[PDB]
Design an enzyme around this catalytic site. Structure first.
Site, short mmCIF file in Angstrom:
data_model
loop_
_atom_site.label_atom_id
_atom_site.label_comp_id
_atom_site.label_asym_id
_atom_site.label_seq_id
_atom_site.Cartn_x
_atom_site.Cartn_y
_atom_site.Cartn_z
N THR A 35 2.05 -0.31 0.38
CA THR A 35 2.43 0.43 1.60
C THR A 35 1.29 0.30 2.61
O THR A 35 0.16 0.00 2.23
CB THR A 35 2.70 1.95 1.27
OG1 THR A 35 1.65 2.78 1.77
CG2 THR A 35 2.79 2.14 -0.22
N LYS B 38 7.81 6.98 5.92
CA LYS B 38 6.46 7.40 5.60
C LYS B 38 5.70 8.04 6.76
O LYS B 38 4.51 8.31 6.66
CB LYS B 38 5.67 6.20 5.06
CG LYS B 38 6.37 5.45 3.93
CD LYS B 38 5.51 4.35 3.36
CE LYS B 38 6.31 3.46 2.43
NZ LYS B 38 5.53 2.31 1.92
N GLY C 85 1.55 10.45 8.85
CA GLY C 85 2.09 9.39 8.01
C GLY C 85 1.51 9.66 6.63
O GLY C 85 0.66 10.54 6.50
N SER D 112 -2.49 -0.07 0.40
CA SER D 112 -2.86 -1.41 -0.05
C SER D 112 -2.94 -2.43 1.08
O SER D 112 -3.74 -3.38 1.02
CB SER D 112 -1.88 -1.89 -1.12
OG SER D 112 -0.56 -1.87 -0.64
N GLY E 21 2.30 -6.33 6.54
CA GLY E 21 3.43 -6.66 5.69
C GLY E 21 3.56 -8.14 5.39
O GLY E 21 4.24 -8.52 4.44
#
Ligand SMILES: Nc1ncnc2c1ncn2[C@@H]1O[C@H](COP(=O)(O)OP(=O)(O)O)[C@@H](O)[C@H]1O
EC number: 3.4.25.2
Lengths: 174, 408
Positions: free
Chosen positions: A1, A33, A45, A124, A156
């Site tokens: 995430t 989130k 968040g 991460s 991402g």
């Protein structure tokens, strides 16, 4: 995430992706989130349980009610119990919280942290976002929202645990 | 307490008592002295004692009334004992200490009722919040904008505005309560519920003592009935006994009340007599000393009777008018009607036994017996009580003496 918060020109944001992973497979792809708090004045968040949140985000709200909108303090009091209260202690997560005043992270360790430029990148994919965020913020006139966005996409793309579903929450003030 | 001057005291007393100006001033000097004392130093405050008064006069002319209004006008504890009440304690009976006890139990039944006045807004303000909280269960930890718990005062102010008569809607609240109920009850159960919180003990009961000690007024009726008369001797020592028994009270002593320890040294005493048989100097020496003030009251005249009929505030005539109004009946007294009501009262008193202004109450009451019964069947009418009416109703009664000893 990946949770990315940025602040530029009387604008503060918090963005996040929606991937939840179990081992080597994706459980869900659209996890929200990034919520909102304190009568939609304070954005936030987070990385953790959908419930842990709903318990740590409710408590936080009341703390603000006990400290007249003053972010920091409520945050200080929050991180407090979160490492003291027998029960509350098992909760694991990383709250990113930002108001027109400032923005900061909170860890079950009770720490309240204000990063270099209200720039926050937890999760991460955190550092890949920090990197892209830091780049843009220092070499372009892009807006806080545009930043977090692009930073998030970069993340991402690098992070195997971060996808491209977003949830952005802004805030204007000047 | 009151900062009224004697002259203002007498003035205030003129609103309830006709004539008897001297007694008024006597009793007024007394009240002003209590004030005068507190304006003194340490030594002189112990030394200066009440100037007890001895009222001298025939029945029902205003002795007690004067003393009762004086008490009422200084929000002071008041007790009225009949002196002979103790002439029998030589065989058994009430001990004279009862006086200070009662003057205490009423000095309590007074501070208590006057704590329900002060606390009658607390249960219907900072306590009516009980029903509104079960109507709109307040936010999970109110926020805090000193107008945030006043914000509703929209959803909130609606339940309060609608709570102006609309109830009987059963709910429940909280030994607090918990039990499910209505509102003609959850609300009233709240009336007292939240109230006993503000009123404490060691101050309410502690103050009663304070009152009695500082503002107590004892009226000892028929003091002359316990003086020595020349008919026997056995009953005389009993009489003089009550005088000796009363001595500690007016000379300065300590009495035991189930509310504390009262000190009589500053209670004001108004003794009362007719003194047809005995004379104030028949009182024992120690008592005459403690009864420095002597004042006479005159007998009442037909004119005083007319005046008593209507001048006083809430005079019997005024009360009557009020009561008949309750029936939607407009009663009216003409100057001549009243002149005759007084006249009749005077006649009976002169022809039979003289009972002062008391006689007016019974005469007036008989005069009205008929209207009082038919009041409900006369609604919306203007009945005038004129000389004619008066005469048609009282003439035959007053005329017949034996009848008057029964009916008037
Ligand atoms: N001077 C007066 N002025 C007004 N009312 C009086 C007067 N004298 C007597 N009364 C009336 O008559 C009743 C007689 O009682 P009170 O006045 O105490 O006198 P007493 O102590 O001689 O019996 C009272 O209820 C009072 O209202």
């Amino acid at each position: 995430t990946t949770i990315v918060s940025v602040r530029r020109n009387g604008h503060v944001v918090i963005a996040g992706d929606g991937q939840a992973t179990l081992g080597n497979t994706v459980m869900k792809g659209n996890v929200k989130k990034v919520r909102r708090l304190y009568n939609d004045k304070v954005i936030a968040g987070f990385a953790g349980g959908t419930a842990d949140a709903f318990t740590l985000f409710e408590l936080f709200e009341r703390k603000l009610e006990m400290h007249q909108g003053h972010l920091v303090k409520a945050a200080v009091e929050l991180a407090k119990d979160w490492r003291t209260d027998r029960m509350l202690r098992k909760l694991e997560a990383l709250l990113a919280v930002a108001d027109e005043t400032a923005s900061l992270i909170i860890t079950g360790n009770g720490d309240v942290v204000q990063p270099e430029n209200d720039l926050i990148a937890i999760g991460s994919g955190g550092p890949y976002a920090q990197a892209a965020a830091r780049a843009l913020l220092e070499n372009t006139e892009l807006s806080a929202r545009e930043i977090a966005e692009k930073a998030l996409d970069i993340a991402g793309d690098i992070c195997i645990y971060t996808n491209h579903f977003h949830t952005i929450e802004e805030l204007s003030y000047k | 307490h009151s900062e009224m001057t004697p002259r203002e005291i007498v003035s205030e007393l003129d609103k309830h008592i006709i004539g008897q100006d001297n007694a008024k001033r006597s009793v007024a000097i007394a009240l002003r002295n209590r004030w005068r004392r507190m304006q003194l130093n340490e030594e002189l405050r112990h030394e200066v004692t009440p100037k007890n008064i001895l009222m001298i006069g025939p029945t029902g002319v205003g002795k007690t009334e004067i003393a009762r209004r004086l008490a009422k006008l200084a929000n002071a504890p008041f007790i009225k004992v009949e002196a002979t009440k103790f002439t029998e304690v030589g065989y058994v009976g009430k001990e004279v200490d009862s006086i200070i006890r009662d003057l205490t139990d009423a000095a309590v039944k007074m501070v208590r009722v006057q704590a329900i006045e002060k606390n009658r807004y607390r249960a219907e303000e900072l306590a009516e919040e009980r029903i509104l909280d079960v109507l709109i269960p307040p936010a999970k930890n109110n926020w805090g904008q000193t107008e945030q718990q006043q914000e509703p005062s929209a959803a909130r102010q609606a339940f309060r505005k609608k709570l102006r008569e609309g109830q009987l809607d059963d709910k429940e609240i909280e030994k607090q309560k918990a039990r499910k109920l209505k509102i003609k009850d959850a609300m009233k159960l709240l009336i007292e519920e939240e109230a006993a919180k503000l009123v404490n003990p060691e101050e309410l009961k502690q103050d009663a003592i304070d009152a009695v000690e500082q503002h107590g007024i004892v009226f000892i009726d028929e003091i002359d009935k316990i003086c020595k008369r020349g008919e026997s001797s056995g009953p005389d020592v009993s009489r003089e006994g009550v005088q000796r028994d009363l001595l500690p009270l007016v000379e300065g002593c300590t009495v035991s009340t189930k509310h504390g320890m009262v000190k009589t040294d500053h209670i004001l005493f108004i003794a009362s007599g007719a003194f047809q048989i005995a004379k104030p100097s028949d009182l024992i020496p120690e008592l005459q000393g403690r009864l420095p003030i002597r004042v006479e009251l005159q007998a009442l005249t037909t004119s005083d009777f007319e005046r008593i009929l209507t001048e006083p505030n809430a005079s019997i005539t005024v009360q009557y008018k009020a009561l008949m109004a309750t029936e939607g009946v407009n009663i009216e007294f003409t100057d001549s009607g009243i002149k005759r009501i007084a006249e009749a009262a005077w006649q009976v008193n002169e022809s039979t036994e003289n009972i002062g202004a008391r006689r007016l109450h019974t005469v007036l009451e008989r005069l009205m017996e008929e209207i009082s019964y038919d009041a409900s069947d006369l609604s919306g009418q203007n009945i005038t009580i004129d000389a004619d009416y008066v005469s048609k109703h009282l003439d035959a009664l007053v005329a017949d003496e034996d009848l008057s000893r029964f009916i008037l």
